[PDB]
Amino acid sequence: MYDAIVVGGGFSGLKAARDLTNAGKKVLLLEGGERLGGRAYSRESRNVPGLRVEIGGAYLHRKHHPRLAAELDRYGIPTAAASEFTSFRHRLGPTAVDQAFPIPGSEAVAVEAATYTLLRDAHRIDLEKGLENQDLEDLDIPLNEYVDKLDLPPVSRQFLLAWAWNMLGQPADQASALWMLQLVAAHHYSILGVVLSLDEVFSNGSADLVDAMSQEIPEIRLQTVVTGIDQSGDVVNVTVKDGHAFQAHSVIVATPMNTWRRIVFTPALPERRRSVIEEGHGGQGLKILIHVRGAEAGIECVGDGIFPTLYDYCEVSESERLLVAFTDSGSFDPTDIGAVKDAVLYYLPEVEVLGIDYHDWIADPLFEGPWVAPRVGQFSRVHKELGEPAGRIHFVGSDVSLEFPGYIEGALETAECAVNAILHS
Amino acid sequence: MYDAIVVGGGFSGLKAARDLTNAGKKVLLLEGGERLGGRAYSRESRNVPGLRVEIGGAYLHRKHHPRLAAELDRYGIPTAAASEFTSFRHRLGPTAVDQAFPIPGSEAVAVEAATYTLLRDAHRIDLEKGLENQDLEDLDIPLNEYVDKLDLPPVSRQFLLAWAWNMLGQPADQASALWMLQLVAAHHYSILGVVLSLDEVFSNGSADLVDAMSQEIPEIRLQTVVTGIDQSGDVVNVTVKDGHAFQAHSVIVATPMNTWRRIVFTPALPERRRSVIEEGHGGQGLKILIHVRGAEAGIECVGDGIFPTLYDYCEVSESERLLVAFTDSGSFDPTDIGAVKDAVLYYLPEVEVLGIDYHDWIADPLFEGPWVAPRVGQFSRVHKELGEPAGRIHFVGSDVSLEFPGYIEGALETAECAVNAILHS
Numbered sequence: 001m002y003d004a005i006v007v008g009g010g011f012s013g014l015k016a017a018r019d020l021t022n023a024g025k026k027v028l029l030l031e032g033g034e035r036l037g038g039r040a041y042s043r044e045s046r047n048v049p050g051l052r053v054e055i056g057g058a059y060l061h062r063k064h065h066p067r068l069a070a071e072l073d074r075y076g077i078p079t080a081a082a083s084e085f086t087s088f089r090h091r092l093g094p095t096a097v098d099q100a101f102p103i104p105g106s107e108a109v110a111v112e113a114a115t116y117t118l119l120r121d122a123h124r125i126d127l128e129k130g131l132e133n134q135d136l137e138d139l140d141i142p143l144n145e146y147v148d149k150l151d152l153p154p155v156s157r158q159f160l161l162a163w164a165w166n167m168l169g170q171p172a173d174q175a176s177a178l179w180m181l182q183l184v185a186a187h188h189y190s191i192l193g194v195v196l197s198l199d200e201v202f203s204n205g206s207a208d209l210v211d212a213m214s215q216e217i218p219e220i221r222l223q224t225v226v227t228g229i230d231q232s233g234d235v236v237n238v239t240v241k242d243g244h245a246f247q248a249h250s251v252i253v254a255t256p257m258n259t260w261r262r263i264v265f266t267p268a269l270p271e272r273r274r275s276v277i278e279e280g281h282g283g284q285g286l287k288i289l290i291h292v293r294g295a296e297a298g299i300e301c302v303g304d305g306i307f308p309t310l311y312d313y314c315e316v317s318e319s320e321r322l323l324v325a326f327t328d329s330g331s332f333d334p335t336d337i338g339a340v341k342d343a344v345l346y347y348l349p350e351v352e353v354l355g356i357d358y359h360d361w362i363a364d365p366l367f368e369g370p371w372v373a374p375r376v377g378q379f380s381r382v383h384k385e386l387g388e389p390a391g392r393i394h395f396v397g398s399d400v401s402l403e404f405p406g407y408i409e410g411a412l413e414t415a416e417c418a419v420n421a422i423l424h425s
Numbered sequence: 426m427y428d429a430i431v432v433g434g435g436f437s438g439l440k441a442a443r444d445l446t447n448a449g450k451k452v453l454l455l456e457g458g459e460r461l462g463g464r465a466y467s468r469e470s471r472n473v474p475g476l477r478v479e480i481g482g483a484y485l486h487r488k489h490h491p492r493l494a495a496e497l498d499r500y501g502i503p504t505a506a507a508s509e510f511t512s513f514r515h516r517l518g519p520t521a522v523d524q525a526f527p528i529p530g531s532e533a534v535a536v537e538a539a540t541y542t543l544l545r546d547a548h549r550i551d552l553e554k555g556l557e558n559q560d561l562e563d564l565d566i567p568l569n570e571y572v573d574k575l576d577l578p579p580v581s582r583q584f585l586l587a588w589a590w591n592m593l594g595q596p597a598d599q600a601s602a603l604w605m606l607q608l609v610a611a612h613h614y615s616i617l618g619v620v621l622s623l624d625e626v627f628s629n630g631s632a633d634l635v636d637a638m639s640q641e642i643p644e645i646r647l648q649t650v651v652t653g654i655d656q657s658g659d660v661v662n663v664t665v666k667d668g669h670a671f672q673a674h675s676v677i678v679a680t681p682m683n684t685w686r687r688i689v690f691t692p693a694l695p696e697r698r699r700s701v702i703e704e705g706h707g708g709q710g711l712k713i714l715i716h717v718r719g720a721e722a723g724i725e726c727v728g729d730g731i732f733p734t735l736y737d738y739c740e741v742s743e744s745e746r747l748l749v750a751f752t753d754s755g756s757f758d759p760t761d762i763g764a765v766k767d768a769v770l771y772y773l774p775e776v777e778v779l780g781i782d783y784h785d786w787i788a789d790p791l792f793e794g795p796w797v798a799p800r801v802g803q804f805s806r807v808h809k810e811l812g813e814p815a816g817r818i819h820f821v822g823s824d825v826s827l828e829f830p831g832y833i834e835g836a837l838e839t840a841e842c843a844v845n846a847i848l849h850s
């Protein structure tokens with residue numbers, strides 16, 4: 001008999017189980033994998049021996065994320081300022097200049113006018129409310145259709161389409177404008193603040209903060225896949241893959257949105273929620289770490305190819321480096337090494353590919369998707385309630401975060417609300 | 426006894442008299458000066474013999490001003506492109522960059538936020554309604570207080586404050602924020618569109634378009650300053666200072682706004698209009714053509730000096746050159762030759778000043794004004810009423826324009842309205 005059972009051992013699960021234990025509650029953590037952290041995946045490189053690489057994500061903003069900075073200050077995890085870019089090799093047409101802002105002086109008027117349209121539509125969205133309660137049905141259309149409404153000149157059009165396919169991790173025909181404007185609204189109402197918010201990085205990786213949080217949790221059961229949560233009786237029963245089952249008064253679900261459908265809930269989750277969970281969000285984001293030779297430090301290649309963004313990651317040696325590429329799993333196939341070469345040679349012909357390192361998050365049964373990006377029409381119907389508790393069962397994660405979706409801060413912010421509901425209720 | 430008498434030989438007055446005569450009406454032109462065109466002053470330079478310069482203004486845009494191009498396509502008068510800028514000498518701080526857009530990348534996020542607030546408030550103005558009846562009283566406050574509300578970084582602030590001093594011809598503490606937003610609203614809701622509307626210019630000066638329009642008007646009287654209008658009887662009486670008087674069914678007043686105090690109206694103008702007319706607008710714009718040597722080919726200087734804008738005008742020779750400086754009559758003394766030497770020294774210390782050429786429109790009794798720029802409060806109280814007919818007396822010009830004020834287009838647009846009102850009424 002536990003006070004709370006936390007399903008999942010990610011940043012939401014590691015914080016929720018820890019904070020409840022400190023109050024005096026008997027907490028059990030159930031992780032279905034062989035490791036804790038989740039999408040904060042920090043391992044040794046498959047390409048280079050003795051090179052610690054971030055498969056998930058490290059980048060962060062100190063003033064943007066106070067809770068994340070509070071955890072760094074608590075355990076003493078140091079953060080250094082993020083690397084800047086010096087070299088630029090874009091493929092945004094012949095009239096584009098190769099620098100930080102590739103937009104020519106001819107487009108300046110139209111970009112200025114489009115900035116207003118993008119900001120105004122984003123300023124409509126309130127972060128404290130939901131994407132369902134603000135009459136934002138007119139903004140939930142395919143991204144490519146919404147981008148054409150701006151009628152952007154060649155360079156500004158493709159530059160915005162490249163970063164959107166980076167950030168959302170889904171092509172313009174699949175991506176929703178509402179979620180694109182949500183990401184603007186989430187980043188202090190700023191279209192530039194989506195990219196320029198990469199202020200500081202994890203110096204030792206996410207692994208240091210993951211292990212430090214796990215140290216203050218007394219009971220963790222690894223390789224324990226939860227297949228169902230049942231709150232029939234007076235207490236909530238949690239059943240597991242391997243037969244067994246656990247029981248607790250309250251239950252924390254700290255698993256990604258695309259994995260909730262694999263869990264049988266009794267009684268079933270509210271009708272508003274049901275249908276979107278079964279089909280899942282259209283997050284197909286793909287991150288490949290290319291091991292290269294003949295590449296300089298601080299290159300940024302934002303163009304129009306199958307790799308919309310290809311830029312510098314870290315130094316391997318004197319000549320060898322790592323380039324990080326962003327695309328989607330549906331469009332690009334990472335298993336074709338010839339397709340990798342053709343994508344890199346599109347931006348840098350002199351640079352040769354030595355190897356690749358990635359993780360297929362959409363293929364993994366414990367995630368079925370990387371970070372949150374809804375399909376056209378999903379979050380207009382239900383969004384706020386997806387992270388709102390149903391009985392004794394709480395739903396947390398970066399997928400349900402209203403303030404910072406798809407960020408480590410969002411994982412800690414949502415889990416904090418779940419702990420507050422149990423202790424003060 | 427005429428069908429209509431147009432008072433003023435400016436672009437508004439010439440168009441009003443011409444279009445009515447072409448319609449088949451008996452029209453009389455009355456100009457108090459020794460020349461036609463008005464603020465369209467294009468004559469020989471005082472410093473350089475033979476060289477023809479624009480004392481008033483020639484900077485037009487075929488896209489922003491479609492009616493000005495309609496006259497240029499009518500008479501076949503050609504126009505040449507803008508004097509592009511290559512050299513940049515800015516005084517916006519060490520953080521600024523010496524380019525066309527001097528705002529650094531450190532302020533890129535700050536401009537983004539300030540652009541929205543400036544555009545949103547500009548979009549709040551409907552051009553057709555008028556500034557007096559749109560509830561914009563909160564925007565009709567001193568410019569220095571408005572710019573402080575946005576809270577701008579050193580460069581982005583002073584770059585906006587310098588161009589505002591030029592475009593309005595008023596210092597920040599005297600200029601109205603509503604009028605600054607009006608210029609943006611008139612320029613297709615664009616801050617960059619205000620500056621990037623120095624597009625094409627008159628190849629032979631404004632005199633080409635002035636003399637072409639005047640030769641289609643039969644009855645023109647030069648050196649006839651109108652002292653009053655009387656519409657009390659069956660027909661409207663127009664009294665002159667010499668050669669008094671004249672008679673017509675309709676009367677058009679195309680004289681500058683600040684001269685309407687001198688003309689006595691019977692019956693007196695509506696109570697709404699008497700408040701602003703009898704004090705006039707606070708526009709003090711001072712354009713100074715400075716003859717120099719040792720100056721670069723295509724300089725642009727924007728800073729925090731008494732000359733907010735000092736840029737390249739035209740090539741005098743391979744050594745000697747003509748520059749143009751914008752300021753106001755109150756803050757700067759154009760008679761003081763030593764003050765011009767010091768003001769140019771602030772931006773270009775290696776440049777010798779030889780002579781100056783200007784014309785004070787403030788001191789001129791025929792103008793009492795340069796181009797229109799209202800005082801704080803004036804245009805939120807009464808605006809469109811000033812350009813509306815006072816019975817049989819029609820009011821036109823660029824001063825009372827809503828579509829494009831302070832431009833030759835405004836004189837062109839208003840003249841079309843008054844002619845259509847008399848011909849159809």
Ligand SMILES: Cc1cc2nc3c(=O)[nH]c(=O)nc-3n(C[C@H](O)[C@H](O)[C@H](O)COP(=O)(O)OP(=O)(O)OC[C@H]3O[C@@H](n4cnc5c(N)ncnc54)[C@H](O)[C@@H]3O)c2cc1C
Pocket residue numbers: 007008009010011012013030031032033035036037038039040041055056057058059060224225226227254255256259263285287361365366367370371396397398399406407408409410411
């Ligand atoms: C490519 C990429 C780039 C990123 N970049 C950034 C960035 O720049 N900045 C930033 O702040 N964040 C970034 N992140 C996002 C961040 O890594 C995640 O949002 C964060 O790890 C979410 O933590 P969580 O605990 O809420 O969910 P998760 O970390 O996904 O935790 C879920 C855990 O539950 C387990 N689980 C799933 N199903 C079951 C089950 N049925 N039974 C038991 N356990 C189960 C999973 O194994 C997993 O360990 C990035 C992520 C990716 C993938």
Ligand SMILES: Cc1cc2nc3c(=O)[nH]c(=O)nc-3n(C[C@H](O)[C@H](O)[C@H](O)COP(=O)(O)OP(=O)(O)OC[C@H]3O[C@@H](n4cnc5c(N)ncnc54)[C@H](O)[C@@H]3O)c2cc1C
Pocket residue numbers: 432433434435436437438455456457458461462463464465480481482483484485649650651652679680681684688710711712786791792795796797821822823824831832833834835836
């Ligand atoms: C320094 C400067 C720069 C400019 N730059 C530009 C520019 O770059 N682009 C642009 O589009 N526009 C520019 N203009 C603005 C434009 O020239 C004017 O605002 C306006 O178009 C002038 O035409 P108007 O017919 O409205 O007035 P006016 O041309 O002044 O017409 C009124 C005429 O009536 C006469 N008059 C006055 N009183 C009497 C009376 N009592 N009886 C009889 N006649 C009288 C006056 O002598 C005057 O000639 C500039 C103006 C100035 C001063």
